[PDB]
Each structure stands twice: as structure tokens, then as C-alpha cells.
Design a binder for this molecule. Sequence first.
Ligand SMILES: *[C@@H]1O[C@H](CO)[C@@H](O)[C@H](O)[C@H]1NC(C)=O
Ligand SMILES: *[C@@H]1O[C@H](CO)[C@@H](O)[C@H](O)[C@H]1NC(C)=O
Lengths: 50, 49
Amino acid sequence: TMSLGAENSVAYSNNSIAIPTNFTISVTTEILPVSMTKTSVDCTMYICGD
Amino acid sequence: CTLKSFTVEKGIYQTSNFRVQPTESIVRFPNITNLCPFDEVFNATRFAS
Ligand SMILES: *[C@@H]1O[C@H](CO)[C@@H](O)[C@H](O)[C@H]1NC(C)=O
Ligand SMILES: *[C@@H]1O[C@H](CO)[C@@H](O)[C@H](O)[C@H]1NC(C)=O
């Protein structure tokens, strides 16, 4: 069976805040297509070749 | 003649493609074929009755 992840458990309260004391720069990536190949077709030489 | 009009506008147009004319007619066949020895029939010295 697929595991959705390590069951975590967050400890909510009503008088408790959790403030980070350190940070981290993190160069991610993202990849995107922009254009595809530019084809063309001539009817007479495809259907009726010679 | 490809736009079927009389005016054309500033641009590039993909007309027909060019291919030089195929004119002649070639019929090549293996010359390995040999003549059947019918000479033995027609040039036979004596025919049957
Ligand atoms: C937090 O919640 C509990 C449960 O209702 C309550 O008794 C308590 O008074 C709350 N905290 C404050 C600061 O009111
Ligand atoms: C913050 O984190 C970096 C590495 O993650 C560490 O070198 C640095 O000492 C940390 N600073 C503090 C104040 O914890």
C-alpha cells in the first residue's frame, strides 16, 4: 500500500509559539517547456508522392 | 496561385515544393533469361509421322 508519509503530530497549544532561530538559502529549480518543434507538410508529396 | 488571390502581403509564403520532372520510362529485366532450345524442334532432321 502507498505510504503517504511519516505520520507527524503537531503539538498545538493556546499559549505556545515556535519561532525559528536560524535560516537557510535554498536554490531550487523549475523546468518549463516554451516552444515545440515547428513542422510543415506539403499535401501533394505526402499523399500523392511522385 | 497558391493563395488564390491577386494581391499578396509583406511576408513569406510556403508555395508548392519544386521537384524536376520525371520524364523517361525505364524497364530493365535480368538478361540472364536464355532462349528456349526450340531449334531442336524446328531444325530437327526428321519429323515424326
Ligand atoms: C488553554 O485552553 C485550556 C482548555 O480550554 C484552558 O483551560 C486554558 O485556560 C487556556 N489558556 C488560557 C491562557 O486561557
Ligand atoms: C545557523 O546555521 C548555520 C548552518 O546551518 C550554522 O553554521 C550557524 O552557526 C547557525 N547559527 C546559529 C546562531 O545557530
